[PDB]
Design a protein around this ligand. Structure first.
Ligand code: HEM
Ligand code: HEM
Lengths: 145, 145
């Protein structure tokens, strides 16, 4: 239930998400590409799903990957902005869930993004506390897959 | 090319885009739904394209339409944020162009959005000068369709 998952976003969790996003969201291009490259490096079995982006090993030099990465960061910006209203958070989460359902991405595979999130957060001096907060947001999307 | 279309957006145009977005973008849910509902009212022939959203006449109450509309506003937020770097604007515009090319939306059909944009801008007292500025940004997307 995406609704029960959304209920897990308590006051403390929402605060950690916002505080960490202020830093991470300030460089969408850089952190977005870092997130994607980390995903591909740590989970090579996921590269097949991104055939449309071409050679993802080119990282920032790949125009399609950069466009994709920047756009992905605005999906997260969207989620953060909807934290105040669960009804709105849910409808945007389901809209994005559809985009992945069509690509045949399961809740389990979507969850593979938690590893990269923790690593990027760590490189910015945000520990486990913050990685767990983000895992709860990711869990809302997983509930819709 | 798309680059030529973007590279042409002048300082005055970007200024008008940013000033109007400060207001329009401060209420993404309200203005996004208003944009979509206006498109369906003035161009009923486009309704068929949005069958995934269910009954679009339900407006705000339709969760799928609400989620689509809010998300649409973040694509625009993305564009506005990339105005000072044509290279980044181009790659995000091309990514979004693919989403519509797959739905068989032509450059001409995409331009139908200019009417609704003009009307919603007018509701917030932003005149022709501003509508012309947005038509120029829409033209950047049309260059990719
Ligand atoms: C923080 C989590 C994630 C976010 C916010 C996110 C966001 C996005 C966005 C905005 C798009 C573009 C949607 C479209 O235009 O159709 C997208 C595409 C895609 N995502 Fe994700 N995603 C996430 C995690 C994942 C994971 C972990 C996988 C797979 C292991 C995945 C697989 C895909 C694929 C295959 C595409 C299509 C790429 C293309 O061909 O353009 N995503 N994602
Ligand atoms: C300011 C102009 C516009 C913006 C920024 C915009 C934005 C978006 C976004 C972000 C999506 C979701 C992409 C995806 O998940 O695959 C979308 C989907 C779509 N757009 Fe647009 N769009 C615009 C104008 C139009 C116009 C004028 C038409 C048609 C006359 C159109 C037809 C569609 C269709 C059919 C979909 C698929 C909806 C669905 O089934 O989920 N768009 N648009």
């Amino acid at each position: 239930s995406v609704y029960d998952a959304a209920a897990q976003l308590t006051a403390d969790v929402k605060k950690d998400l916002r505080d960490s996003w202020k830093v991470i969201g300030s460089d969408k291009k850089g952190n977005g590409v870092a997130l994607m490259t980390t995903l591909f490096a740590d989970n090579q079995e996921t590269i097949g799903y991104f055939k449309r982006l071409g050679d993802v090993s080119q990282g920032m030099a790949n125009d399609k990957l950069r466009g994709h990465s920047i756009t992905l960061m605005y999906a997260l910006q969207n989620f953060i902005d909807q934290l105040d209203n669960p009804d709105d958070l849910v409808c945007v989460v389901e809209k994005f869930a559809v985009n992945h359902i069509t690509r045949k991405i399961s809740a389990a595979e979507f969850g593979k993004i938690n590893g990269p999130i923790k690593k990027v957060l760590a490189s910015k001096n945000f520990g486990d506390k913050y990685a767990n907060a983000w895992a709860k947001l990711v869990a809302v999307v997983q509930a819709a897959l």
